[PDB]
């Protein structure tokens, strides 16, 4: 039995017209969430230096996404939303995790969980640059220009629970092992 | 007589930390999705702290309290679970139980069939 | 803690009666039933609403009607006399204690 998780679900089946969530039971929180999404959004990974590895994002293109999934989430809980960062796991859930070329790349979603959108025309509290490593295990880091080139076609999220938990709504990403 | 093994009780002063353990057998330890915590004061029902899950290490905590102080951990080649609980208060003078569940399907809810006898934090100064 | 309430607080039965233990849940999810002694870990009876575990006896069932989900122990024994427990997922109820009427 090996190891499967990530924030971010890549190159997989997309919507066909609006947003999906899917789950064994919406209710249950220590049950994993499934975001499908409409419109891929790409991502592009470059490692130029040492130690410099990065991973960028559209921010047009992430608040239109989210601000999307704040509204279907509103379908189930219609109450605000926040979407934020996870408090505990490993590695593969609390980076987006991935290996690009022959390098494993684990990247920091700090920037992309984060937001509080409002009950009304949705809102944030008012590019993204996603800090990236690579394991330095076996061996010596590779020098440049090494790019990574994918599309966001889901994501994979776990709500927390409470009562205690008034307010807003959070969810935070990871899981939850196997995929849709 | 019988599994699964919880840590010895002991008296915290207010303001510290405690890192209450929990563990069972391989057989027992491969068969649960999840390991949850909860907690009873005496004169007080049964509260859920949070939950662990003991493939992915994830984590799940019953309100924002519990959330910065509670850390939920396991290993998995130990088989074994652990709670950190940080700021000990009076408030915490509880039984700490711990409760495993088996791999389930979403619907049926949440059913808790192993129990740890329980852990007794006296937050006393 | 708005749903999952639960009621009596306290049974007043003889060996022999029938109990009846009812909880009250918000919303339409299964339910679970514990046994609970003094200085003792809870003991998973029920669980699905009207499963029960295995190396429960025949005396002990669960049922629903509506946010209403009861359960019932037939033909009462000393030892099932003890304080219960219902959980809806991630939610506890107040309580029920079964005492000896007398």
């Known amino acids: 039995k090996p190891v499967v998780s990530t924030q971010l679900l890549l190159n997989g089946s997309l919507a066909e017209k609006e947003i999906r969530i899917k789950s064994e039971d919406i209710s249950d929180n220590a049950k994993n969430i499934i975001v499908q999404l409409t419109k891929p959004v790409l991502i592009n990974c470059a490692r130029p230096s040492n130690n410099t590895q990065y991973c960028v994002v559209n921010r047009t293109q992430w608040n239109d996404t989210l601000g999307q999934v704040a509204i279907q989430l509103r379908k189930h809980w219609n109450t605000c939303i926040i979407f934020n960062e996870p408090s505990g796991g490993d590695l593969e859930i609390t980076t987006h995790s991935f290996n690009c070329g022959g390098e494993f790349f684990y990247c920091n979603t700090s920037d992309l969980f984060n937001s509080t959108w409002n009950i009304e025309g949705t809102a944030s509290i008012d590019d993204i640059t996603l800090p990236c490593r690579i394991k330095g295990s076996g061996a010596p880091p590779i020098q440049g220009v090494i790019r990574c080139q994918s599309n966001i076609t889901g994501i994979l999220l776990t709500r927390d629970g409470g009562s205690g938990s008034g307010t807003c709504e959070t969810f935070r990403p990871g899981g939850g092992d196997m995929r849709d | 007589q019988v599994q699964l093994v919880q840590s010895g009780s002991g008296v915290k002063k207010p303001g510290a930390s405690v890192r209450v353990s929990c563990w069972t057998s391989?057989?027992?330890?491969?068969?649960?999705?999840?390991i949850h915590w909860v907690r009873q004061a005496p004169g007080q029902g049964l509260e859920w702290i949070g939950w662990?899950?003991?493939?992915?290490?994830?984590?799940?905590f019953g309100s924002p309290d519990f959330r910065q102080r509670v850390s939920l951990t396991r290993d998995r080649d130990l088989f074994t679970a652990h709670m950190d609980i940080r700021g000990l208060t009076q408030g915490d003078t509880a039984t700490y139980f711990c409760?495993?569940?088996?791999?389930?399907?979403?619907?049926?809810?949440?059913?808790?069939?192993?129990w740890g006898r329980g852990t007794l934090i006296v937050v006393s100064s | 803690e708005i749903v999952l309430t639960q009621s009596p607080g306290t049974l007043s039965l003889s060996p022999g009666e029938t109990a009846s233990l009812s909880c009250t849940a918000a919303?339409?999810?299964?339910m679970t039933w514990y046994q609970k002694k003094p200085g003792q870990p809870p003991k998973l009876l029920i669980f699905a609403t009207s499963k029960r575990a295995s190396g429960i006896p025949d005396r002990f069932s669960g049922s629903q009607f509506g946010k209403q989900y009861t359960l019932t122990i037939t033909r009462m024994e000393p030892e099932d006399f003890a304080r219960y427990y219902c959980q809806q997922l991630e939610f506890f109820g107040q309580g029920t204690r079964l005492e000896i009427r007398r």
């Open positions: 409760a495993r569940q088996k791999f389930y399907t979403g619907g049926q809810g949440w059913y808790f069939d192993l």
């Open positions: 662990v899950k003991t493939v992915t290490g994830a984590v799940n």
């Open positions: 391989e057989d027992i330890f491969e068969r649960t999705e999840l």
């Open positions: 919303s339409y999810g299964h």
